[PDB]
Ligand binder design. Structure first.
Ligand SMILES: *[C@@H](O)[C@H](C[C@@H]1CCNC1=O)NC(=O)[C@H](CC1CCCCC1)NC(=O)OCc1ccccc1
Length: 174
């Protein structure tokens, strides 16, 4: 499955990485790429934004329609073990680099000193500094679903981790 142009258009440069428009008002990204010391995002004052940060997963809900061209799409907390996702990496040059990843366990994992709630996966030509916040997506029927934002990798690059929304349940390690 190949992500269409509109789906790529949701991937937006942000801070030291990227984020993703889930709907006209909802933007998700990885916490550590979010700028600090600012009074606004995309021109909107912070007090006009509902900012939800759960570990390395950050969601913004803006008061005004920022991307009224977009339909809403489904955001889920990770995906079932074994699902092949696409990480929609945009590079600073403009290059698109969709990476196929077979997803693994949802867990709270220690990464660079902190506990991160996320899902690991095996890359199936990898991720680099600057790529964080890129969405992990997969196709369900005719529609695409987003389930995480890029957060980390191993030094070899073969394992990647996306941050996912907070939530415990019987398919995640706890
Ligand atoms: C996005 O900011 C990067 C993406 C990484 C860089 C290397 N390959 C990738 O996919 N993410 C990070 O650098 C991680 C940042 C941490 C994540 C947990 C919360 C605090 C910030 N760090 C990480 O991936 O470290 C592992 C590592 C990989 C390669 C070389 C050194 C360290």
């Amino acid at each position: 499955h190949m992500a269409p142009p509109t789906l790529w258009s949701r991937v937006t440069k942000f801070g030291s990485g990227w984020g993703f428009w889930v709907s006209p008002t909802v933007f998700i990204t990885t916490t550590h790429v979010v700028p600090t010391g600012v009074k606004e995002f995309f021109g909107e004052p912070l007090s006009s934004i509902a900012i939800h940060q759960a570990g390395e997963f950050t969601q913004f809900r803006f008061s005004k329609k920022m991307r009224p061209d977009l339909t809403g799409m489904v955001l889920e907390e990770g995906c079932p073990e074994g699902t092949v996702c696409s990480v929609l990496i945009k590079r600073d040059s403009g290059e698109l680099l969709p990476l196929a990843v077979r997803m693994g366990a949802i867990a709270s994992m220690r990464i660079q000193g902190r506990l991160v709630h996320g899902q690991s996966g095996m890359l199936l030509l990898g991720t680099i500094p600057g790529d964080c916040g890129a969405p992990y997506v997969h196709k369900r029927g005719n529609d695409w679903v987003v389930c995480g934002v890029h957060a980390a990798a191993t030094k070899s690059g073969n394992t990647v981790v996306c941050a996912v929304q907070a939530g415990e349940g019987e398919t995640a390690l706890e």
